[PDB]
């Protein structure tokens, strides 16, 4: 543990500083150090963990797509073979992405999920597990099937808990359904499942908005709009 000598509170404080400095690799290492202190994470601390790694892996995924697109063209009928360099560098970035995903998955498995009993924590981490198997799935070509089913499994367990324990407007529940929807559309090649899930999720939230405060209304409709954005593209 490179962060083993620093206090948990200081790791959290510096994570918050790193976020303000847009230093997300730092932010991620601080939150990893905080998790490995072994205490459960508060709601704010879980959100710090998620924001940090989403930004890190976001950069790698964007880089990977650029490189994969260049590679595909170089392999099109008519190209002038540039040599191994595009493939090698795509592989480099792909390998670093997979390691980030594996790190996150390691934190969830040792031992965030097993100690998460409240719906808000357990659903959060199970969604994260599905998310990071999904980013693995995006670059997978060889045992893609088991990675995909690992994503599916995590999202499905999260869905089941969210639907029993959370109201339909709960932002965690909405964000999970959003992501599981894109999983269906893009990863599982189940566009009709994706559309069905997104419509039902939106409509069930819509009918529960009346129970919310102004501020909770804002939080839920923000994610409801993401559901609608996708549905517009898909239909």
């Amino acid at each position: 543990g490179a962060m083993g000598s620093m206090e948990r509170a200081s790791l959290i404080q510096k994570a918050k500083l790193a976020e303000q400095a847009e230093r997300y690799e730092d932010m991620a290492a601080f939150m990893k150090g905080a998790v490995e202190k072994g205490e459960e994470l508060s709601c704010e601390e879980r959100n710090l963990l998620s924001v940090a790694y989403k930004n890190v892996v976001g950069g790698q995924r964007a880089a990977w797509r650029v490189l994969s697109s260049i590679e595909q063209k170089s392999n099109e009928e008519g190209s002038e073979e540039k040599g191994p360099e595009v493939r090698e560098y795509r592989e480099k970035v792909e390998t670093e992405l997979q390691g980030v995903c594996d790190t996150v998955l390691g934190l969830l498995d040792s031992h965030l999920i097993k100690e998460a009993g409240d719906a808000e924590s357990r659903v959060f981490y199970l969604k994260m597990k599905g998310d990071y198997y999904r980013y693995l799935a995006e670059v997978a070509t060889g045992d893609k099937k088991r990675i995909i089913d690992s994503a599916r499994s995590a999202y499905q367990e999260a869905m089941d808990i969210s639907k029993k324990e959370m109201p339909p407007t709960n932002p965690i529940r909405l964000g999970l359904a959003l992501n599981f929807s894109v999983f269906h559309y893009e990863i599982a090649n189940s566009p009709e499942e994706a559309i069905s899930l997104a419509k039902t999720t939106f409509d069930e939230a819509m009918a529960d908005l009346h129970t919310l405060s102004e501020d909770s209304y804002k939080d839920s409709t923000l994610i409801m709009q993401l559901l609608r954005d996708n549905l517009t593209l898909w239909t």
Binding site: S50, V51, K54, N55, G58, R65, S69, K127, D131, G175, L176, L178, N179, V182, Y185, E186, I223, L226, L227, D229, N230, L233
Partner: peptide, 10 residues
């Protein structure tokens, strides 16, 4: 690639 909406930042 066209990227669909998912939760949180980009």
């Amino acid at each position: 690639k066209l990227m669909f909406k998912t939760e949180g930042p980009d």
